[PDB]
Amino acid sequence: CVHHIKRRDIVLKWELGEGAFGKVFLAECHNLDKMLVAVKALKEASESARQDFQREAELLTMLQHQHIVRFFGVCTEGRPLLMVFEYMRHGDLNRFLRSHGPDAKLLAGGEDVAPGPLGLGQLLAVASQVAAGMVYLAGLHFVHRDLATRNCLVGQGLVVKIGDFGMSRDIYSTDYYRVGGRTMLPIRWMPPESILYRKFTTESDVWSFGVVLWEIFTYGKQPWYQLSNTEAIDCITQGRELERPRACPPEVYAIMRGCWQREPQQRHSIKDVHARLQALAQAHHHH
Ligand SMILES: CN1CCN(c2ccc(C(=O)Nc3n[nH]c4ccc(Cc5cc(F)cc(F)c5)cc34)c(NC3CCOCC3)c2)CC1
Secondary structure (H helix, E strand, O other): OOEEEOOHHHEEEEEEEEOOOOOOEEEEEEEOOOOEEEEOOOOOOOOHHHHHHHHHHHHHHHHHOOOOOOEEEEEEOOOOOOOEEEOOOOOOOOHHHOOOOOOOOOOOOOOOOOOOOHHHHHHHHHHHHHHHHHHHHHHHOOOOOOOOOEEEEEEOOEEEEEEEOOOOOOOOOOOOEEEEOOOOOOOHHOOOOHHHOOOOOHHHHHHHHHHHHHHHHHOOOHHHHHOOOHHHHHHHHHHOOEEEOOOOOOHHHHHHHHOOOOOOOOOOHHHHHHHHHHHHHHOOOOO
């Protein structure tokens, strides 16, 4: 089951950032010799969060693929609680897309090594890699339920992995709609059946992948940024389609549309989506 780790073996360097979960730190783990790792700490860690911690750790232990952030274990001595991960140096995929879009170079400075917007090849490589993670999850009849670029990570070499299972959801982010009470839904990434009746399936994940493609080729824009969430619920539910992004080739748009068929069983399978993206990333390798 869940590998445990001794607090003494975890040395915190510095905060990488904060979230709903809590802080994430760069750290040095020992005995895995001497190693660089990401450590997510728990903000509250009282009761509900203490057993949602149980869940995530068990889940992350379960999953093992080159496109899922690797998990090493936890540390339950004292407080607050910690999860330990491999280190992805370029952070979340959403911020990475936006900062490396058509004003990466046109707005750089000192701490700016090798700017220039991301090209077609790089975008496809990001897309194919997120697909692969998802092919894997579909294979285990696993349903993510919150696939979006904010829950992917980027590591050195444009290595992109799925890194979070939306276990902690930002109460204050427009990316989420409070259905009622404490339940937050990422409605802009969800299809009609999920928005109306919370039917989550591998076919609702493929829809969300479609939307991830859209985020990728708009360089990180929020789907339906023009709309508030209630307006967006009405469009999505009425059958409205996001526009082909400026940077998006027609063939990539046709894939998005295959992920967005209205009837779930008519959506393209993630496996076929993955293959078709890989073919496209192949055919552009040398241009
Ligand atoms: C250009 N800059 C470069 C530096 N930078 C970074 C870099 C790395 C992280 C970070 O925590 N990385 C993680 N590595 N492994 C994780 C596992 C797990 C996690 C948790 C997680 C998973 C995920 F899929 C998305 C996340 F935002 C956070 C992180 C790492 C990092 N952390 C913040 C990213 C934004 O959210 C707050 C923390 C920032 C910012 C951009």
